Amino acid sequence: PITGLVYDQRMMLHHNMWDSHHPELPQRISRIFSRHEELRLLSRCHRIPARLATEEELALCHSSKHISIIKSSEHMKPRDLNRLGDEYNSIFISNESYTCALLAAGSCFNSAQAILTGQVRNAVAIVRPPGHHAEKDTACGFCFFNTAALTARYAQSITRESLRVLIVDWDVHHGNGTQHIFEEDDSVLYISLHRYEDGAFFPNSEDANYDKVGLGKGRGYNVNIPWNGGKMGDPEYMAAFHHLVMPIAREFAPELVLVSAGFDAARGDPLGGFQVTPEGYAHLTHQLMSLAAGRVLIILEGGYNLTSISESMSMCTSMLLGDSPPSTPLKTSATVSINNVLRAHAPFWSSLR
Numbered sequence: 001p002i003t004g005l006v007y008d009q010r011m012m013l014h015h016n017m018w019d020s021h022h023p024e025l026p027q028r029i030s031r032i033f034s035r036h037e038e039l040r041l042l043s044r045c046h047r048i049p050a051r052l053a054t055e056e057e058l059a060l061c062h063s064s065k066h067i068s069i070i071k072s073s074e075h076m077k078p079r080d081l082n083r084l085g086d087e088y089n090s091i092f093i094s095n096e097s098y099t100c101a102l103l104a105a106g107s108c109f110n111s112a113q114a115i116l117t118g119q120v121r122n123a124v125a126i127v128r129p130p131g132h133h134a135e136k137d138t139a140c141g142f143c144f145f146n147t148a149a150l151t152a153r154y155a156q157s158i159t160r161e162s163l164r165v166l167i168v169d170w171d172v173h174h175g176n177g178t179q180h181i182f183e184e185d186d187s188v189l190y191i192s193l194h195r196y197e198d199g200a201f202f203p204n205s206e207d208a209n210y211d212k213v214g215l216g217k218g219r220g221y222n223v224n225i226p227w228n229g230g231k232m233g234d235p236e237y238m239a240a241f242h243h244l245v246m247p248i249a250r251e252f253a254p255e256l257v258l259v260s261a262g263f264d265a266a267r268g269d270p271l272g273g274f275q276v277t278p279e280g281y282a283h284l285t286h287q288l289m290s291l292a293a294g295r296v297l298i299i300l301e302g303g304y305n306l307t308s309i310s311e312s313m314s315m316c317t318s319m320l321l322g323d324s325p326p327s328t329p330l331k332t333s334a335t336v337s338i339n340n341v342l343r344a345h346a347p348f349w350s351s352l353r
């Protein structure tokens with residue numbers, strides 16, 4: 001009956017030495033943590049310590065070469081950090097980046113351990129840099145290692161290889177790295193909702209479309225819900241949960257739920273362009289709590305309006321703690337999107353028929 005929370009100020013040390021106004025700001029996590037104190041949520045949680053991921057733990061999802069390259073950045077002079085960052089899509093690197101990425105992952109491992117050992121029922125991880133764009137072999141989109149993917153594998157590593165993990169990715173961007181890491185996996189169901197715009201929206205790949213349903217044994221275990229045609233909000237996200245996320249998740253019967261919880265679909269976010277409310281995120285969290293006997297871990301991904309993300313993630317933690325959720329026609333293109341995913345996944349999920 002207990003909610004865990006992990007936060008460590010040391011993850012603020014990752015920074016952009018060339019553009020101090022880059023939106024993936026150190027203050028993202030400190031503003032969220034402060035808001036939890038202001039709302040008297042922090043004192044209601046069980047504090048879970050951060051730790052470093054080990055390199056062996058990173059090898060659950062990443063190549064030895066990728067690990068060694070990111071690790072080599074901690075001793076680089078600035079022009080070599082610039083060159084290295086430029087070898088990726090939308091990455092900046094400081095000497096502290098690698099350690100911060102390790103702390104983000106190890107924090108999530110400790111939270112998953114706390115859940116799976118029964119110390120807490122659910123947990124929230126206020127971490128940066130984010131993870132879901134990171135691939136096996138490369139960094140991408142502000143992400144170095146795929147924290148959520150690694151946490152799924154870590155969870156399997158302390159229970160059984162086939163532990164059913166559901167990852168719900170409600171960051172406004174597609175988690176390309178998460179999709180690829182689990183594309184052939186039927187033990188990890190990946191469900192992403194994301195702005196798509198026929199490939200115009202970052203990370204700009206048709207991999208994010210609704211017809212990418214997984215490969216081989218994982219066919220049916222990758223659910224992309226792509227939005228086209230501009231701003232979406234609470235109605236569209238509630239309908240996507242109602243028609244797709246929750247029926248599929250209930251059929252899958254996960255033993256652990258991880259939320260890749262970006263808050264860049266929030267009202268006010270300058271990169272997402274969407275209008276999901278803090279109350280909306282509260283309802284999404286409360287629905288996911290009905291899964292997996294409540295074993296839910298909310299992991300911060302993106303989200304760039306400091307006030308928006310502080311309010312939205314605090315609302316999610318309020319739901320984890322058992323507070324009552326707070327108090328409509330869809331954009332026509334959202335109906336088109338939902339029906340496209342429904343047709344793509346009806347062959348795999350009887351609940352959609």
Ligand SMILES: CC1(C)[C@@H]2CC[C@@H](CNCc3ccc(C(=O)NO)cc3)[C@H]1C2
Binds near residue numbers: 130202
């Ligand atoms: C040059 C810039 C720094 C300007 C200000 C934001 C970025 C956005 N370019 C791509 C992008 C978006 C979002 C994420 C993300 O991880 N969101 O969670 C990752 C990558 C470019 C434009």
Ligand SMILES: [Cl-]
Binds near residue numbers: 079082
């Ligand atoms: Cl330079």
Ligand SMILES: [K+]
Binds near residue numbers: 170171172175192193
């Ligand atoms: K997403």
Ligand SMILES: [K+]
Binds near residue numbers: 183186
């Ligand atoms: K999968």
Ligand SMILES: [Zn+2]
Binds near residue numbers: 171264302
């Ligand atoms: Zn994002």
